[PDB]
Write a protein that binds this ligand. Structure first.
Ligand SMILES: Nc1nc2c(ncn2[C@@H]2O[C@H](COP(=O)(O)OP(=O)(O)OP(=O)(O)O)[C@@H](O)[C@H]2O)c(=O)[nH]1
Ligand SMILES: Nc1nc2c(ncn2[C@@H]2O[C@H](COP(=O)(O)OP(=O)(O)O)[C@@H](O)[C@H]2O)c(=O)[nH]1
Ligand SMILES: [Mg+2]
Lengths: 430, 186, 217, 50, 431, 47
């Protein structure tokens, strides 16, 4: 049976998962008590008499975001052993999350990963939610994904990493923890989908017409992306597009596996009635650079491979007629060696809406996961950011004293140049 | 067979020139033909195997499937002409652990594959005629930890022109080659 | 150097072009790799186009590790282990749907042996870019696991630089040269955690796979 | 002026981190020096026992 | 007593074949439960061609369903007319091939081939006098294009005297539904030229134009295209199941439509299609169906038949019609535009009639065409191949499953050989 | 026994759920309310 295991690492991992697991409960009707009043088998496992538990572990070194779930409205849904906590946090230190503190808690993390994998019949993949700009989200996630590649082979890893923006970020040492995590997210993660913070702030500011939203409103429509890409396993549709379709169709070369994300209908309640949710409208709106969840200009680069995840009353013709107009437009440039660029998945369920959420109840939706060479421009922003800070070796003795040698920064930065030189290698026309 | 009849040095297993070339070799054809043709450059009668399918037509040295062959020599030398077509030959050996290991070289593959029972090999050849020096001991030592003892089966299933396939103890060039083994005669 | 139907004239000489297209494609790939390498500024073996054998040997390591794990690392499922081991045959029936219109998944999994269609250790001895590796293939020994020579060379280089006391990230005017993980010995295969896992599962790994072949010759 | 400021900054930082790691070595020394008298007396007890 | 084994591979093969058994059950009167409720004896005269009689007098289809993902069989089984099939015939996997030809044909599909071939051998040996094996699958995917062609190669070795009717959809020209369409299409066509006896070519884009221009369906659903495809499949086998003045079985079609052993790719089309706004104004006669038969817009193939010459075309007429109207209309279509037909085969048209029209129509016809214009389809996919092949893009997923890169060059050099003989037969002239 | 009657009731509930899912699949697998090929109305097939 289709069965996924999701891992949430770091303070961004739980808070996205809090918004994620709010949505999967309403999709299958699961109450916060954990009782439904066969499609639930992916993200939930039946337990005893009518009780369903999530197939997830919430691990974080800091106990603040973990016990908030333990005292929250979902205190009966999660297994108490699944919520793994620690004494002290990594405290924005990649060396603390990977060498000193992260060694003791990763043994208990794999004890429940093994327990979750044994109970379910067929694994389909791994869904990791973390922020590479933090200590636990990067350092402990680097060690955890290193375990999962060396132990659980041939099962794909879906990476949803919150990534720093050049315009604004909320930590001084964002360049270090993100550069040091680049080695782990290259070799180990099979599929990595990028997310950026204030690129999705502008989604709320412009599309949702809200001037002052917060992290709670930020992560709810992240869960819209996560649920839409996994919705083909849960519910029947015209084109059943599973997890293993993403790895076989969105990456041509095994280390350039970085893809974008974009949700097409992002409209409020009062804007929903005036505007006509046409399939040609949402497909045009999805490919618009404004609707991307990371700051990329697709005009700068070329598309490599695009996956389209349609939901609701989408007939298989309007998906074809809308995307045929996409190829004819000049502003959407594809790479020369990939004539067959699109992957279309059509599902048969409208997206659910949470009570109190900003998003309106819409008949149709598009979630596009696309590979582009403009994704290399994100890492170029972090490149000069790292080298200017590393020139005077500021904020280094925190990493040096916590197990790491000073040389580890050198191959980590020079690993990032291998990622940059790969993107402008594959973008070169022949 | 061929265990008591052991000759020092070379041991010719199949020679095309003679009153009856296919003296010990079994024959098998399917949408193909076996044809003794005198070629152009050598002007000598050589056997030819042709077929539209590689795996269908073959000739095997042991005629009965139950019977086995024995040569203790670690070299197999075949003189074949490159037809710019598929070639394929297969040699089965008995290793140290009394196990049957089949080394099977072909022209239609570029990467070698080592399964626990059968190893598959690429073959690249020059333009015209050629001799191929299949080193039994070296190839079985590279493929597996065991060492060569004897060769049980040799079988060409290909589109080729064969003459002078034989077994050798070690590499022997033209100036120390015996009288009738040349095919070049300088 | 220097009567029959059209279908037969195609079919007779078709296998010659079957041969010829591969060396035509190999020459085309060599010139594309050289032009791309000169355009982007890296070695031809360093290029992203030539990462196929690395993914192949990664797949072989993962499959051998999964088939040579112990029972508890593979899975401690009480139904799976017991109902697979109820007799000499190892098959489990996985029900799907209700009992009325039900479907069955017949999982067959024999421990300690690779499947016949999966037991293959594939390497390439003809592509020249893997000549320093001596034939890109799967190695199950911890000493030769991954890329050991380049890792040792990089370790010697960084030890020599540390002993000489030079500083490398001093200037922002000089961008670093873009070498790959396989060049630094920091690929997936060269991980210390595969090293220790293969070391701890080494005996049954050699039970499944008897010898690591050297594909150079 | 800027170039000498660069090199004196680097010399200062390397000297500071050398002193920090030296003090860490001092702390390790004084922390594991306590295991020496107990192993001395236990070895003497072993020798007298044999 | 002639009888066809149905094999449905992949998401496309299961979804189309679910709709295919809807027509066949309705034509033979089999209810949703499976029991016979026909109103004519002629339906029950030949049921053993597709159905096996079980307990209670209900009939189970002779269909074997295969896919490596359990999602597709849940839709087939739980859907309407889904209880007729046998759960033992639902031979299926768990891991999922996932659009990869290497996974379906070499590694992951191979552990299920010994299971699917066991239930095909059971269905083949139990029944008395086989015709062939009708297989419905795709070519852009990897689970049905991969595992299906492994069965086709394997079932040819076991039964070499039986035919292989393959209904394979191709990549669309305007759109790609999977990113690896040129990889899977070229690697499967090469596996079909030497194995499949005769091939029917379909695509989504040609059926989209049919549903919009002629049927006037502005929102043609996923099963509306399958209904048009299912009507073609029943039209191929019409002379077997029902009598007629000129019966033509599967072997008569292939001995007529195949001049040379590798020119066995055909384009198809169902003739009596009209919208409800124009149903009451259409005069359904032999000239009216023949006018709609030979039109390019009625074909279910992306290749435009005006570009090349029809080497051989066949039509499987149904309905109480006169043979002379069938005779003189197909004589007239050759003479009016003889440039669009080949010249060295006289009498290109294979005409046959079946006296029982389908349910709801007084007259119908199913057209088969061996046109050399279909070389434009293989030229397009090979053009998409060399663009993707020259950079090794999306190639390590194929070679990571033990596949050599020789099979890529093996595949397209048979594809290039296939398109080369199509061009040379069109250019060739007699005297 | 009462367990047998309960099993029969559970089987009937399973049949009702399968009928509902089949109705959903047919209703959103057929677009227009009329047969595409022939003049015939579209009905859910029951027997
Ligand atoms: N999208 C999203 N990102 C968040 C959210 N909360 C925090 N983040 C990101 O996470 C960063 C904050 O540090 P974290 O990575 O969460 O810290 P951590 O993972 O717990 O690591 P330690 O604090 O050292 O234990 C911010 O820069 C944000 O970019 C959230 O609710 N939604
Ligand atoms: N006409 C038609 N085409 C279909 C149907 N289902 C899938 N396809 C085509 O099949 C291709 C994708 O095949 P896929 O689902 O990946 O097959 P799989 O790999 O075997 O699972 C697409 O190009 C679709 O257009 C169907 O019901 N009808
Ligand atoms: Mg934290």
């Amino acid at each position: 049976m289709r069965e996924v295991i999701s891992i949430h690492i770091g303070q961004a991992g739980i808070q996205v998962g809090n918004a994620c697991w709010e949505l999967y409960c309403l999709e299958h009707g699961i109450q916060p008590d954990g009782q439904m009043p066969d499609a639930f088998n992916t993200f939930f496992s039946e337990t005893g008499a009518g009780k369903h538990v999530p197939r997830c572990i919430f691990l974080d070194l800091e106990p603040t975001v973990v016990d908030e779930v333990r005292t929250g409205t979902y205190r009966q849904l999660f297994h108490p052993e699944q919520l793994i906590s620690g004494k002290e946090d990594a405290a924005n230190n990649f060396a603390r999350g990977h060498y000193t503190i992260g060694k003791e808690i990763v043994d208990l993390a794999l004890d429940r990963i093994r327990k979750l994998a044994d109970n379910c019949t067929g694994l389909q993949g791994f869904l990791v939610f973390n922020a590479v700009g933090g200590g636990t989200g990067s350092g402990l996630g680097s060690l955890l994904l290193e375990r999962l590649s060396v132990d659980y082979g041939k099962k794909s890893k879906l990476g949803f990493t919150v990534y720093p923006s050049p315009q604004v970020s909320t930590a001084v040492v964002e360049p270090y923890n993100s550069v040091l995590s680049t080695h782990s997210l290259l070799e180990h993660t099979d599929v990595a989908v990028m997310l950026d913070n204030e690129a999705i702030y502008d989604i709320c500011r412009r599309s949702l017409d809200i001037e002052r939203p917060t992290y709670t409103n930020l992560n709810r429509l992240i869960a819209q992306v996560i649920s839409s890409l996994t919705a083909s396993l849960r519910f029947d549709g015209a084109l059943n597009v599973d997890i293993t379709e993403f790895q076989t169709n969105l990456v041509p070369y095994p280390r350039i596996h970085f893809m974008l994300s974009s949700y097409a209908p992002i409209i409020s309640a009062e804007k929903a009635y005036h505007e006509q949710l046409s399939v040609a409208e949402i497909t045009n709106a999805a490919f618009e650079p404004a609707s991307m969840m990371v700051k990329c200009d697709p005009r700068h680069g070329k598309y490599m491979a695009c996956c389209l995840m349609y939901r609701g009353d989408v007939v298989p013709k309007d998906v074809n007629a809308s995307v045929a107009t996409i190829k004819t437009k000049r502003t959407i440039q594809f790479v020369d060696w990939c004539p067959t660029g699109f992957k279309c998945g059509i599902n048969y369920q409208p997206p659910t809406v949470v009570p109190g959420g900003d998003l309106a109840k819409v008949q149709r939706a598009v979630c596009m996961i696309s590979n582009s060479t403009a994704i290399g421009e994100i890492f170029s922003r972090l490149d000069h950011k790292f080298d200017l800070m590393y020139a005077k070796r500021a904020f280094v003795h925190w990493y040096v004293g916590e197990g790491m040698e000073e040389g580890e920064f050198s191959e980590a930065r020079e690993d990032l140049a291998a990622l940059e030189k790969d993107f402008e290698e594959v973008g070169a026309e022949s | 067979m061929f265990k008591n009849a052991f000759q020092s040095g070379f041991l010719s297993v199949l020679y095309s020139i003679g009153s009856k070339p296919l003296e010990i070799w079994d024959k098998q054809v399917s949408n193909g033909h076996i044809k003794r043709i005198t070629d152009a450059d050598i002007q000598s009668s050589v056997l030819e195997i042709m077929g539209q399918n590689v795996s269908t037509t073959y000739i095997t040295c042991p005629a009965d499937p139950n019977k086995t062959l024995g040569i203790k020599l670690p070299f197999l030398v075949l003189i074949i002409k490159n037809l710019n077509k598929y070639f394929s030959f297969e040699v089965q050996v008995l290793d140290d652990k009394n196990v049957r290991r089949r080394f099977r070289a072909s022209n239609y593959q570029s990467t070698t594959r080592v399964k626990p029972f059968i190893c598959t090999m690429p073959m690249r050849l020059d333009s015209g005629w050629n001799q191929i020096q299949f080193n039994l001991s070296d190839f079985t030592r590279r493929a597996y930890g065991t060492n060569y003892i004897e060769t049980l089966r040799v079988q060409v299933h290909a589109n080729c022109r064969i003459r002078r396939i034989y077994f050798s103890d070690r590499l022997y060039s033209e100036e120390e080659l015996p009288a009738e083994f040349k095919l070049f005669l300088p | 150097r220097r009567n029959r139907t059209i279908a037969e004239t195609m079919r007779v000489a078709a296998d010659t072009r079957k041969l010829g297209k591969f060396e035509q494609q190999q020459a085309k790939w060599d010139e594309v790799s050289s032009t791309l390498a000169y355009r982007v500024g890296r070695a031809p073996t360093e290029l992203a186009m030539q990462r196929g054998p690395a993914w192949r040997t990664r797949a072989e390591l993962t499959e051998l590790l999964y088939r040579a794990q112990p029972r508890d690392a593979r899975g401690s499922n009480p139904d799976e282990v017991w109902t697979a081991s109820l007799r000499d045959a190892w098959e489990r029936i996985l029900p799907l749907g209700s009992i009325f219109s039900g479907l069955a998944i017949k999982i067959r999994d024999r421990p300690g042996e690779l499947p016949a269609t999966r037991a293959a250790r594939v390497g390439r001895p003809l592509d020249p870019l893997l000549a320093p590796l001596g034939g890109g293939g799967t190695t199950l020994s911890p000493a030769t696991l991954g890329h050991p020579a380049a890792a040792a060379a990089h370790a010697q280089h960084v030890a020599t630089l540390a002993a000489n006391g030079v500083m490398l990230g001093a200037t922002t005017n000089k961008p670093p040269l873009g070498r790959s993980l396989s060049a630094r010995g920091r690929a997936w295969e060269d991980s210390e955690m595969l090293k220790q896992r293969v070391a701890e599962y080494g005996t049954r790994l050699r039970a499944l796979a008897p010898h690591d072949p050297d594909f150079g010759a | 002026r800027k170039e000498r400021d660069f090199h004196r900054m680097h010399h200062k930082r390397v000297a500071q981190e050398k002193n920090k790691l030296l003090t860490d070595l001092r702390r390790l020394k004084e922390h594991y020096a306590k295991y020496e008298p107990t192993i001395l007396e236990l070895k003497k007890k072993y020798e007298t026992l044999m | 007593m002639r009888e066809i084994v149905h094999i449905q591979g992949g998401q496309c093969g299961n979804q189309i074949g679910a709709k295919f058994w809807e027509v066949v059950s309705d034509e033979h009167g089999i209810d949703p439960t499976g029991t016979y409720h026909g109103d004519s004896d002629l339906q029950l005269e030949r049921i053993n061609v597709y159905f096996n009689e079980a307990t209670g007098g209900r009939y189970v289809p002779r269909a074997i369903l295969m896919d490596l993902e359990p999602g597709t069989m849940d839709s087939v089984r739980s859907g309407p007319y889904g209880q007729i099939f046998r759960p033992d015939n639902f031979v299926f996997g768990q891991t999922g091939a996932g659009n990869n030809w290497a996974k379906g044909h070499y590694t992951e599909g191979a552990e299920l081939i010994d299971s699917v071939l066991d239930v095909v051998r059971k269905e083949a040996e139990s029944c008395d006098c086989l015709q062939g094996f009708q297989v419905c699958h795709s070519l852009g995917g990897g689970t049905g294009s991969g595992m299906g062609t492994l069965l086709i190669s394997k079932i040819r070795e076991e039964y070499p005297d039986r035919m292989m009717l393959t209904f394979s959809v191709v990549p669309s020209p305007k759109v790609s539904d999977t990113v690896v369409e040129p990889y899977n299409a070229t690697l499967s066509v090469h596996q079909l030229v030497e194995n499949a006896d005769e091939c029917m070519v379909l695509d989504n884009e040609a059926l989209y134009d049919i549903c919009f221009r002629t049927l006037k369906l502005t929102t043609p659903t996923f099963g509306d295209l399958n209904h048009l495809i299912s009507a073609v499949m029943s039209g191929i086998t019409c002379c077997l199941r029902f009598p007629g003045q000129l019966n033509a079985d599967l072997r008569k079609l292939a001995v007529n439509l195949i001049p040379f052993p590798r020119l066995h790719f055909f384009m198809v089309g169902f003739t009596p299609l009209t919208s409800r706004g124009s149903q009451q104004y259409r005069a359904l006669t032999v000239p009216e169906l023949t006018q709609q038969m030979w039109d390019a817009k009625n074909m279910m193939c992306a290749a435009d038949p005006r570009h090349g010459r029809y080497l051989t075309a066949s039509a499987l007429f149904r309905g109480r019609m006169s043979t002379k109207e069938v005779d003189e209309q197909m004589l007239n279509v050759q003479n009016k535009n003889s440039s669009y037909f080949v010249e060295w085969i006289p009498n290109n048209v294979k005409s046959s009639v079946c006296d029982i029209p389908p349910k709801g129509l007084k007259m119908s016809a199913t057209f088969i065409g061996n046109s050399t214009a279909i070389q434009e389809m293989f030229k397009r996919v090979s053009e998409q191949f060399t663009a993707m092949f020259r950079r090794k893009a999306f190639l390590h997923w194929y070679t990571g499953e033990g596949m050599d890169e020789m099979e890529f060059t093996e595949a397209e050099s048979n594809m290039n050989d296939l398109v080369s003989e199509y061009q040379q037969y069109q250019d060739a002239s007699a005297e | 026994s009462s367990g047998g009657q309960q099993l029969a009731a559970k089987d009937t509930a399973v049949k009702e759920a399968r009928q509902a899912r089949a109705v959903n699949l047919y209703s959103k697998s057929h677009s227009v309310s009329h047969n595409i090929i022939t003049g015939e109305p579209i009905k859910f097939p029951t027997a």
